[PDB]
Amino acid sequence: PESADLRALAKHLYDSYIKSFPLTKAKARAILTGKTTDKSPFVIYDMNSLMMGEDKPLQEQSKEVAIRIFQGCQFRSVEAVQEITEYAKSIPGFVNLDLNDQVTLLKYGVHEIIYTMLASLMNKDGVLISEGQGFMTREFLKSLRKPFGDFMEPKFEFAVKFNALELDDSDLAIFIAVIILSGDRPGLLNVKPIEDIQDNLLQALELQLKLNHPESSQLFAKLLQKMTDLRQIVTEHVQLLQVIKKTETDMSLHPLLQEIYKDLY
């Protein structure tokens, strides 16, 4: 009965996730594998293939190129933000929380979730861009001038490890709900009901991983460590902000590469 209720919670979350997120992990992987009906993504793997790509314009200045990238990617994240917000409303107990706390939890949580989404678009070789119609290689991105060449590499490093857990959508639904109901965000008024919902979600997650991945070893534990890696990845992004503001001049970047980065995070 306890276990039945943990299974029912997992199902509720999964159904709600499918309703809220059009871009699922299964859909990303079907594009990355080829199972998909339609023709494959165009591969950008060098400057020539970059120029030969145009599936997507004003003249950007030197010491602004990087900040304009971070700002632009954050603005294009809004539909994800809205999707996550919608999913969050379906998490039992969440809308009965203090409005102030709902907003806080999302303000911090969304960035961690956006990285989990980013991982679904990646493999060890590259990342899907331009609504899944393009594929930009990891090798190419790593080859670009300092500081840009170090922008994406750590997200690939995380994504290879995270994707090695082999989570599916039904697992990810509960994972993301666990990330959102973090009782340690700064400024929370009433933590008790938050940590209480998250404890229930943690139960549900444990059982889901046992049932969906009976073969695995410390999958629960390994997955919980990824919250740290996401945390860590989010806290860091600032360290990129301040390598920029004083870098060995200049920060020219080809306009198609600036366009591509605004699709990342």
């Binding site: 933000v81 809205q82 917000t85 919608e86 409005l99 709902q102 907003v103 999302l106 969304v110």
Partner: peptide
């Protein structure tokens, strides 16, 4: 442009 992430979220919650 004075409306940030919280505005998007608050709007979406309402």
């Amino acid at each position: 442009s004075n409306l940030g992430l919280e505005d998007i979220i608050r709007k979406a919650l309402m």
